[PDB]
Amino acid sequence: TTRLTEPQLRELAARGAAELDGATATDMLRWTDETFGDIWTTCNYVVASNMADAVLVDLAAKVRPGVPVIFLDTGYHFVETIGTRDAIESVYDVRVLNVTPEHTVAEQDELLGKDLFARNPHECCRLRKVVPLGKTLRGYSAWVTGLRRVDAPTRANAPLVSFDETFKLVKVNPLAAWTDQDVQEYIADNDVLVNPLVREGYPSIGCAPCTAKP
Ligand code: SF4
């Protein structure tokens, strides 16, 4: 494998969380790149995005050109989300990776009942998001997400750096301390791309069947 050892990863996550207490998003990404950078697509840390905007993508490309960015194409996405994905891949200096489940929508419908998302959403999410994400992250020692502590009351204590137990690696959230005004001013000052559905009155953007219509 190409993963770092579990105790090594836990100690690195602890040292990073202690050392980056109160750092800006760029400082966290700089530390991540300095730690897991070598030994441009030949990288040891990856960035994850839901294609709702290109804030974290812009930052990661500014600190590391050609950085890999994973997108979980569950086959239930909006056409606008796939269009935003393509736009970010064409514009930004980023290596995009289309993480797809091994079974298509039609295949899963025929093998486990049509529209499995409506009959059991947890298993659909596990099959099309969690399992492919884990199979892809096997190989990377750390991964970066655009999680903000304001996303939910349960996310209020989201750490800057920690050890993700679900995939057993290092998880760093640069946008954790960011507020809505923060991301708004950043998008304004940097002219970064935004999913059209966000402009069309959508709080969050996920799979088409499991997104609350306004
Ligand atoms: S959000 Fe809905 S459609 Fe998308 S993977 Fe989860 S259960 Fe399936």
Sheet with strand 142-144: strands edge to edge: 94-99, 67-72, 45-48, 142-144, 169-172, 161-164
CB 26 within 8 A of CB 62: yes
Residue 110 DSSP class: H
Q: Which CATH superfamily is domain 6-200 in?
A: HUPs (3.40.50.620)
Q: What is the resolution of this structure in A?
A: 3.1
Dist. CA 56–CA 146, nearest whole Å? 6
Residues 6+ apart with CB under 8 A from 160: 16, 17, 20, 21, 23, 28, 172, 173, 174, 176, 177
Which residue has the CA at smallest separation from atom 8 of ligand 1? 124
Where are the chain's structural domains? 6-200
For 143, phi and psi rounded to 5 degrees?
Answer: -145, 145
Q: Which amino acid is at 137?
A: L
**133 CB less than 6 Å from ligand 1?**
no
Does 43 show up as a binding residue in the annotation? no
Please say whether the beta carbons of 143 and 173 come within 8 A: no
The per-type count for the chain, helices as H runs and strands as E runs, is 10, 6
Q: How was this structure determined?
A: X-ray
Q: Which two tokens stand for residue 22?
A: 């109160």
Give the SS3 label for residue 35. Answer: helix
Identify residue 55 by its one-letter amino acid code.
V
Element (H, E) at 163: strand 161-164
Q: Cα(83) to centroid of ligand 1, in Å?
A: 19
The span from the CA of 80 to the CA of 77, in Å, is 8
